[PDB]
């Protein structure tokens, strides 16, 4: 079945809150169609700074990752599960891929906070908010359900699978 | 994974269309839309639609719709050049961050395609379609920038404007780049020297079948049939390999089975694509009467969350807020 | 005239051809095989084999297969610009010289644009294919040369390497200029939008008729039928005109009949080719129960020496001597 | 039918001759098969300098002329009679065309004359060579079958056909 949900930027505490709604005044709102048995696939679709509060491009990305995490992190966590182990069978790998990503994501960070002119880096800025959100977001939903949340490594890990692929073996 | 961009005869219509090929134990899927209220001057798009999987905040596939009328296709190339991947480091950024830059900054394929290259990570090294529906009239014309093609290998992006092949009649992706420079950069004539013509550009097997029957294409449901295309026990081309054409099965290869291969189609032309719709089917091909994929077959690979059985349909997908 | 180059889709043959179009007091028609026995450090070929005329000493159509393993197609492009053609001179040689100049002195395809470009005369304006069969590797490559596209308008020769186009099916001619240059140059743009789309590279009929089915040449046979195709009643591209396809019937127009259109076709592969062999028939089509054509019905035209009637088959052409 | 013919070239009075047979010695050789009305074809055969005479390259181009011009004249004379009145319905035409093709062969031969070192023009005259043995040739045929020979003009009429389609209505 589908589930909706709705997030709200609180400006003075700088953090969201999620409802279990759809609220088109909300900050991003949408839902999780959880058909992937019905059909194959799970639908997601989220509609992001189109409510009442004007928000900065930064927040806008950042909450719909927030929603986005909010409603999926069941399934992020189940992808994780299923694709480690095709990447990685043994600890060695960890090691290289641990670094690589940590190195890679400092240098981004780093990077982004250097060129807060850039036309390009603000826009790296975006997509880096909605990952935050992403990773805010589903430890939100882990927390309220009482699951050890997933961390930003097995986040990072989900996003770079393409990156690894070619990489790990080198 | 198998791409392929067809126009019909008299330029009535472009169909473009994507099948995935990645280890079964990927196929919890989700179809996303999204929309965020973006406001920047050298913002081109903040809104698109395109298949995914959960935590994914890109398609990998890839398949995607873009609201600055770019439509973005991409099949793996490999690098066997060690030397060149040597070069390698984390000071650069990740391909999905490129591919989310480039898409939400770019107004045309050239644009796209300079974007893309900025901090080129020489990771996850593929050959990009960036297909730019403004550029499409059809009855009429396929006017200069509709089809840029893009390649990464570490240290460098190739990248050319590619119409006038289009307008021949067809693009087709393979995992065989393109570019003379990057397809021996990377070391595919040594590995054509010594494991023969399925490493070449022009002779692999889904060159040859669809060079042979891309002209078959006349709408969708023959574009579909394409792009689910097996046949691996009739078709000349396949030598009797299922994995061997267009969607790959894997797991029917009959002394190494695996659970891998194709598993998925997505495909739209240039009328769904204006409303962010397509067509989309998740699992094996089942297409000339090929077995249904069971999980139960290959029961101690994980496979969280997914169905047991895969014999879905095409479903319509679409925003609807 | 229509031409069509036609490689199969694991490169296991390779077709060539030519339909003649012109006024049907052409029709007296001699085939040619010379061999010359010149020695002369500058000359690469003096053996030829070509369709022609009386009194020719060149094909016209053109239709060669040279010993240097170059075999030369040819369609004629118009030249709209009365102010290009203004530069027309005497002072130059006339095509039929710098062909046979190039076609003597060349041993690939950009050496014969080179040797054909000088003291251009600006007069029969044409795409030349320069198929280099040197080049040709079946199951294997189209190496780099293997097709040159030649197109001359007065002042002016512009040339260019095809085979990455080639590679993925076929290079058609049909009367209208390849190189933006030359059809801007030429008027082309003009004619478009004072006439419509048959003047427009991409969307000419013969071009939608070759882009739906050069992918239905699969041998010989099938080569043979799309090179005399004419269908016209029932081809949405034709719109009823039995000119508008790529063996045009202008005798059976039914409000302004003329005795002209197409009136042969030669058809090679690279295996006839090597022994100086093709197919060619004499007269316009009869493919599809068209009727055959009979001079009775145009009996004020002079067409001395020829046959009344044209219902002739494809014959082998092959030197004996 | 099968037309036999062969042409020698005699050095000291620098003429062909011509017999109706094939015959293998001869500096130009071959055959004109007449199938014309049974396959819409006439074929046309020649092998040159291949006899018992070492020949220069010219004299073997100037013998392929005459033999395809003794063979084929009447067939010439058929198709100009054909294609003349396609191109020329006027004398005024008919005068634009003369001055063109007058002009532009006494081009052709002062260059032939002229560049007697240079690769392209000495190949411009074996094509040049070619021709009036192909006029030689016709004529000598004429002479013998009592008819009018056709002139030179008419030669490069034909030769010319292509050149003269966009042409004309200049
Ligand atoms: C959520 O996905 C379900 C699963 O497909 C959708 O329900 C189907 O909708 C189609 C087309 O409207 C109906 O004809 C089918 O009978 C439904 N099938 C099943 C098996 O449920 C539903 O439409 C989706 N909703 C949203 C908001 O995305
Ligand atoms: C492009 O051309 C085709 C016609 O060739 C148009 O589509 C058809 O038009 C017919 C008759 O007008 C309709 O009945 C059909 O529904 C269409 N399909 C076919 C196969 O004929 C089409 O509308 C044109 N497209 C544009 C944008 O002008
Ligand atoms: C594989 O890639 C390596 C690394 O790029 C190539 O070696 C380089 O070649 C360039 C240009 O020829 C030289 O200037 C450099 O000396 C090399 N660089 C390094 C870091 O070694 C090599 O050419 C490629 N291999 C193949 C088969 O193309
Ligand atoms: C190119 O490949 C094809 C085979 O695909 C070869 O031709 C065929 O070979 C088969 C079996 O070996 C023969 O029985 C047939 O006569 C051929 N035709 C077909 C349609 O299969 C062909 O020989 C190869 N060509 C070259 C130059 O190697
Ligand atoms: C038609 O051809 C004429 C003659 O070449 C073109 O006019 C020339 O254009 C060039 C470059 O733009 C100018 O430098 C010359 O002044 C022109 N030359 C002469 C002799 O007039 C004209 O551009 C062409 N027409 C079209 C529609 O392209
Ligand atoms: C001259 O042309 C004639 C006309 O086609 C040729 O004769 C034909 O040859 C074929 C194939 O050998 C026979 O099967 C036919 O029965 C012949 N047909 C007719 C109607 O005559 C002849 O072979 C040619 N000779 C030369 C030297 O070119
Ligand atoms: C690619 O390799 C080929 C074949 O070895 C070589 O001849 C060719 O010039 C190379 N091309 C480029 C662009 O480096
Ligand atoms: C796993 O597969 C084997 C057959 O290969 C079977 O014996 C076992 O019970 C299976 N478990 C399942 C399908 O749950
Ligand atoms: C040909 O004409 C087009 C359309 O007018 C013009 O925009 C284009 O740049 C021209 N191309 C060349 C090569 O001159
Ligand atoms: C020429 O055609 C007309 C019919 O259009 C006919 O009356 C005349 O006799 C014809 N002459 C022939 C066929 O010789
Ligand atoms: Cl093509």
């Given at each position: 079945g589908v589930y909706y949900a709705t997030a709200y930027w609180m400006p003075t505490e700088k953090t969201i809150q999620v409802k279990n709604v759809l609220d088109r005044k909300g900050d991003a709102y949408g839902f999780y169609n959880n058909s992937v048995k019905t059909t194959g696939w799970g639908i997601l679709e989220i509609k992001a700074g189109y409510g009442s509060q004007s928000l900065s491009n930064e927040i806008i990305m950042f909450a719909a990752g927030f929603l986005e995490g909010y409603l999926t992190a069941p399934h992020m966590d189940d992808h994780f599960t299923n694709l480690?182990?095709?990447?990685?069978?043994?600890?060695?790998?960890?090691?290289?891929?641990?670094?690589?990503?940590?190195?890679?994501?400092?240098?981004?960070?780093?990077?982004?906070?250097?060129?807060?002119?850039?036309?390009?880096?603000?826009?790296?800025?975006?997509?880096?908010?909605?990952?935050?959100?992403?990773?805010?977001?589903?430890?939100?939903?882990?927390?309220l359900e009482g699951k050890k949340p997933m961390t930003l490594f097995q986040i990072q890990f989900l996003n770079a699978i393409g990156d690894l692929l070619d990489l790990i073996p080198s | 994974c198998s791409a392929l961009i067809k126009?019909?005869?008299?330029?009535?219509?472009?169909?473009?269309?994507?099948?995935?090929?990645?280890?079964?134990?990927?196929?919890?899927?989700?179809?996303?839309?999204?929309?965020f209220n973006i406001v920047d001057k050298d913002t081109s798009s903040s809104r698109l639609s395109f298949s995914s999987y959960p935590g994914f905040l890109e398609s990998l596939d890839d398949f995607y719709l873009l609201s600055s009328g770019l439509v973005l296709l991409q099949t793996t190339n490999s690098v066997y050049n060690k030397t060149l991947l040597q070069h390698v480091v984390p000071q650069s950024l990740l391909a999905w961050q490129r591919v989310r830059v480039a898409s939400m900054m770019a107004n045309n394929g050239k644009q796209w395609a300079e974007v893309f290259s900025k901090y080129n990570s020489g990771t996850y090294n593929n050959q990009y379609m960036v297909l730019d529906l403004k550029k499409v009239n059809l009855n009429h014309s396929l006017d200069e920038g509709t089809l840029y093609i893009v390649e990464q290998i570490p240290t460098y992006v190739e990248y050319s404007e590619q119409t006038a092949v289009l307008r021949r009649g067809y693009w087709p992706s393979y995992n065989i780049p393109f570019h003379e420079k990057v397809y021996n950069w990377s070391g595919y004539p040594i590995l054509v020297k010594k494991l023969g013509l399925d490493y070449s550009y022009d002779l692999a097997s889904r060159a040859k079948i669809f060079r042979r029957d891309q002209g078959k294409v006349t709408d969708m449901e023959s574009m579909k049939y394409i792009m689910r295309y097996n046949n691996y026990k009739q078709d000349p081309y396949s030598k009797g390999d299922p994995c061997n054409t267009v969607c790959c099965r894997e797991d029917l290869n009959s002394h190494s089975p695996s659970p891998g291969g194709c598993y998925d189609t997505k495909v739209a032309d240039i009328y769904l694509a204006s409303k962010y719709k397509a067509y989309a089917i998740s699992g094996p091909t089942v297409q000339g009467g090929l077995p249904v994929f069971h999980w139960s077959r290959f029961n101690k690979t994980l496979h969280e969350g997914m169905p047991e059985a895969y014999n879905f349909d095409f479903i319509t997908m679409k925003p609807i807020l």
């Open positions: 480690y182990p095709q990447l990685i069978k043994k600890r060695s790998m960890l090691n290289k891929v641990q670094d690589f990503l940590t190195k890679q994501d400092q240098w981004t960070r780093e990077n982004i906070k250097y060129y807060k002119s850039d036309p390009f880096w603000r826009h790296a800025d975006y997509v880096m908010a909605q990952m935050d959100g992403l990773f805010a977001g589903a430890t939100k939903r882990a927390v | 126009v019909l005869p008299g330029f009535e219509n472009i169909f473009f269309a994507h099948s995935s090929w990645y280890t079964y134990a990927a196929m919890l899927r989700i179809y996303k839309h999204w929309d």
